[PDB]
UniProtKB/Swiss-Prot annotation, chain B:
The modification (Microbial infection) O-AMP-tyrosine is found at Y27. It is linked to Takenouchi-Kosaki syndrome: An autosomal dominant syndrome characterized by macrothrombocytopenia, lymphedema, intellectual disability, developmental delay, and distinctive facial features. Its EC number is 3.6.5.2. This is Cell division control protein 42 homolog. SMART domains: RAB (SM00175), RAS (SM00173), RHO (SM00174). It comes from Homo sapiens. It is a lipid-anchor. GO terms for molecular function: apolipoprotein A-I receptor binding; G protein activity; GBD domain binding; GTP binding; GTP-dependent protein binding; GTPase activity; identical protein binding; protein kinase binding. Changing G11V: Constitutively active. Interacts with PARD6 proteins. Does not inhibit filopodia formation. No effect on NR3C2 transcriptional activity. The gene is CDC42. GO terms for biological process: actin cytoskeleton organization; actin filament organization; adherens junction organization; cardiac conduction system development; cardiac neural crest cell migration involved in outflow tract morphogenesis; cell junction assembly; cellular response to type II interferon; dendritic cell migration.
Length: 152, 173
């Protein structure tokens, strides 16, 4: 399927602007960036522990986060796990119209929902990389993997 | 027909463990993805959409984006955390009431399994504090217009399923 990430971003930014009055988006940008990146990091850790059945102590988790933090020159938060971009898409008209179109023949409340969550992951990553090029998701993942290797 | 249920509250309240414990019906991840489940109530199959807010506790610019279209909120607090119970009245209810004044919410108490733990009462007995009781809990549920008040333990799963049945019940209006 195809979607105009640019229009989505404008709709996401508009939503952010309702919070204040000057329509500031700076604070939102800062928070989302460290949050999206932190969740990307936590996601990589989850995938690592799952396949290996390993258990990394929160201490070690911190060393990994600081390592990724230094490598990216970006402040992180090891509790990061929910991006407001993905949550924004969840209740966005344009995005959900695409979810429907994509579910096509199927509308088992469950299948539709899973399709929605899968598309939410894909589109927010795309939205993140076009507006937050501090580093790309694949890069963040690789850097993290190298941290896990070094400290785990 | 998917009911949107969002879990709000302070960190260290165990919101994530609460959703994972419920959906394990494996490796417990840090990041909980939106999950939907079909629940039977009065012979009718309802689809419950579950959304976590873990990590945004103090990223005030992010939280608002989770609220549009929410059918029911679970405002959580740890029974063994007087500061989390206090933030419900102080931060969470005011926040959801602001963004979703018509949306119902249950007052939820977690980690009731530690309420029966000396170590906790001891290292709670420090700052002149004691675990929270259902009584003191309902009075706040009352004061804040919560639909109801329920509690559970992600750990023991006691009262878990009930929490979510009520969430659905509350949303069905």
């Amino acid at each position: 399927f195809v979607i105009n990430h640019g229009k989505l971003t404008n709709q996401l930014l508009q939503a952010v602007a309702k919070q204040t009055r000057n329509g500031d988006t700076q604070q939102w940008f800062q928070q989302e960036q460290t949050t999206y990146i932190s969740r990307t990091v936590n996601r990589t850790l989850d995938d690592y522990c799952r396949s290996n059945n390993s258990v990394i102590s929160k201490e070690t988790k911190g060393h990994i986060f600081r390592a990724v933090e230094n490598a990216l020159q970006q402040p992180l938060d090891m509790n990061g796990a929910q991006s407001s971009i993905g949550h924004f898409l969840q209740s966005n008209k344009y995005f959900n119209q695409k979810v429907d179109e994509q579910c096509g023949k199927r509308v088992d409340p469950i299948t539709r929902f899973n399709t929605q969550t899968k598309m939410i992951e894909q589109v927010s990553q795309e939205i993140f990389e076009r507006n937050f090029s501090g580093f790309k998701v694949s890069e963040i993942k690789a850097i993290t993997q190298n941290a896990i290797l070094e400290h785990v | 027909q998917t009911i949107k249920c969002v879990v709000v509250g302070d960190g260290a309240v165990g919101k994530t463990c609460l959703l994972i414990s419920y959906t394990t019906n494996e490796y417990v991840p840090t990041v909980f993805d939106n999950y939907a489940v079909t629940v039977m109530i009065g012979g009718e199959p309802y689809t419950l959409g579950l959304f976590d807010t873990a990590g945004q506790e103090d990223y005030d610019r992010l939280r608002p984006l989770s609220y549009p279209q929410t059918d029911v909120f679970l405002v959580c607090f740890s029974v063994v955390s007087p500061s989390s119970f206090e933030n419900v009245k102080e931060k969470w209810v005011p926040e959801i009431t602001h963004h979703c004044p018509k949306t119902p919410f249950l007052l939820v108490g977690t980690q009731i399994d530690l309420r029966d733990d000396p170590s906790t009462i001891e290292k709670l007995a420090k700052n002149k504090q004691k675990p929270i009781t259902p009584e003191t809990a309902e009075k706040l549920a009352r004061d804040l217009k919560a639909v109801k008040y329920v509690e559970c333990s992600a750990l023991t799963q006691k009262g878990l399923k009930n929490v979510f049945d009520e969430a659905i019940l509350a949303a069905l209006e």
